[PDB]
């Protein structure tokens, strides 16, 4: 039983570099191997490199080779992953995976680190209402950067029948998202519906009352 903790998520401009740390603590086995696997949104799993910190041996993937260096500070059992010369394609969640015991049968993972590689910089969202057609209504969280955002309804009082859809990437380089909710038709001109949009990264919380217009 070990505890893999990865570094906070970050956003870098194209061309620059990123360094992702991965702290380990516990597990007697001091002969462990570290693997770095990334996953671009919607796509499959992609291996990048593996290090055996103790021995000092490290392999890399054909694809990246040159752009990626995996180091390890043996004292604090913290693994590292440096990817330089960044492009848009490199936007992904990155995982460190520790493997223990003879065959490497012991599976341990970090929580993941989100790296967003884009030109356009941190911006707040604009919440636009999708006026009601049981009837359906919702919000449109448009033009924000970076991910993620969190949408709730009536501070969490309405959580039944709500659909928050995965964001999409507009050509502008900003994200657009829509939330919807199936509500009773009869409750329309009587019950209040407000979506609360929280965007931690840009430091912006916006609430918006949705009503027929």
């Amino acid at each position: 039983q070990v505890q893999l903790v990865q570094s906070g998520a970050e956003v870098k401009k194209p061309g620059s570099s990123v360094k992702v740390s991965c702290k380990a603590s516990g597990g007697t086995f001091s002969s462990y191997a570290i693997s770095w696997v990334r996953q671009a949104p919607g796509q499959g799993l992609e291996w990048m490199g593996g290090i055996i910190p103790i021995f000092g041996t490290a392999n890399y993937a054909q694809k990246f080779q040159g752009r990626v260096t995996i180091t390890a500070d043996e004292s604090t059992s913290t693994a590292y992953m440096e990817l330089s010369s960044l492009r848009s394609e490199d936007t992904a969640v990155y995982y460190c995976a520790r493997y223990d015991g003879i065959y490497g049968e012991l599976d341990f993972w970090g929580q993941g680190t989100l790296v967003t590689v884009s030109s356009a910089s941190t911006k707040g969202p604009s919440v636009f209402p999708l006026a009601p057609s049981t009837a359906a209504l919702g919000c449109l969280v448009k033009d924000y950067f970076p991910e993620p955002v969190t949408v709730s309804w009536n501070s969490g009082a309405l959580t039944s029948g709500v659909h928050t859809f995965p964001a999409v990437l507009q050509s502008s380089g900003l994200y657009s998202l829509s939330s919807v909710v199936t509500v009773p038709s009869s409750s329309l001109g009587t019950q209040t519906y407000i979506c609360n949009v929280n965007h931690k990264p840009s430091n912006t919380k916006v609430d918006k009352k949705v009503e027929p217009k």
Partner: protein, 213 residues
């Protein structure tokens, strides 16, 4: 470099059934150096099977791997409600260490047609200079569906983005939203805004539309 392919793409079953998952390799794999992993939406992967056919410690009875060389299998004898997720075969024979595109295990349910809804762009957004028309496809099954945008019966493609939810736990269905985005100027140049939906739960296509104003 070795390439891995899995079959089928998605797999649709119910709790208590047998699942059979494949992994066609394009080359030989060191006697049997292939792994299987589990992944739930927005979570770190999870090693299940190493060396083609050896359960990792903790992994329940029902799981088992088979075959070697260039052809591999993963098999869950009786599906538990927790066994519905993406599965990835991975070879650790020759570098670069490669993964498969994955197989989704989803709950099979009876076919359900989508409730189609269309939202014209808000007053507030039209001030800012761009118009976003949202088409919502609600609680439908299976996931396969088409959306065709029409503007005065000139079919559209390129100027819309779409996004599907993960399978609902409550009713085993999916939901898809599509956003047709174009400028204030372009939106005013036209009259009819239609949304044609072709899901297999429909006898023929459905069209939901509105006239601007």
């Amino acid at each position: 470099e070795i390439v891995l392919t899995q079959s089928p793409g998605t797999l649709s079953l119910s709790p208590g059934e047998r699942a059979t998952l494949s992994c066609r390799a394009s080359q030989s794999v060191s006697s049997s150096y292939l792994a299987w992993y589990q992944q739930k939406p927005g979570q770190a992967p999870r090693l299940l099977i190493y060396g083609a056919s050896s359960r990792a410690t903790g992994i329940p009875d029902r799981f088992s791997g088979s075959g070697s060389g260039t052809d591999f299998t993963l098999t869950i004898s009786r599906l538990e409600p927790e066994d519905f997720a993406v599965y990835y075969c991975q070879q650790y024979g020759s570098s670069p260490l490669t993964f498969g595109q994955g197989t989704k295990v989803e709950i099979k349910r009876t076919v359900a047609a989508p409730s189609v809804f269309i939202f014209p762009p808000s007053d507030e957004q039209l001030k800012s200079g761009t118009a976003s028309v949202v088409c919502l496809l609600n609680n439908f099954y299976p996931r396969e569906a088409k959306v065709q945008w029409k503007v005065d019966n000139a079919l559209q493609s390129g100027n819309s983005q779409e996004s599907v939810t993960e399978q609902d736990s409550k009713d085993s269905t999916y939901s898809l939203s599509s956003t047709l985005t174009l400028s204030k100027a372009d939106y005013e140049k036209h009259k009819v805004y239609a949304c044609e939906v072709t899901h297999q739960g429909l006898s023929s296509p459905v069209t939901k539309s509105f006239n601007r104003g």
